Amino acid sequence: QLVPWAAASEFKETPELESAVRAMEAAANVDPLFQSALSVFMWLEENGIVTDMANFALSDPNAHRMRNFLAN
Amino acid sequence: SEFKETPELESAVRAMEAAANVDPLFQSALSVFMWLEENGIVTDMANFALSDPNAHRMRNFLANAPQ
């Protein structure tokens, strides 16, 4: 289901990537919170902000600044 | 809120960790993924993404975050 998305993504095309995306879809099927996180995960990659967000999270380890941004 | 502790979760975490060990970019994505859940902002970020589908507003926030 998500293998074509993985193959076209910026992630390095490895057998581990392909098992990961499959496994994530299966986790999302049985847990809607994991599905919400998967949706964000894909949105970060599609918009090219994976490393930008990872770098931000280092500066905001408790999500304090992000949580206030999202709340407003 | 927290991920439901299903067998699928444990399988997904281990798969993601194995993909992250091979590819630093996937490790960055995994770190963000875990950071969202640890801090309880998964649904908040998912709702924001629905309203900012091209990440334009998120890009501006990240660009203006303190150095």
UniProtKB/Swiss-Prot annotation, chain A:
Coiled coil: none annotated. It is found in: Virion; Host cytoplasm. Homodimer. Interacts (via C-terminus) with VP1 in the cytoplasm. Interacts with VP2. This is Capsid protein VP3. It comes from Avian infectious bursal disease virus. The chain holds residues 756 to 820 of 1012 of the full protein.
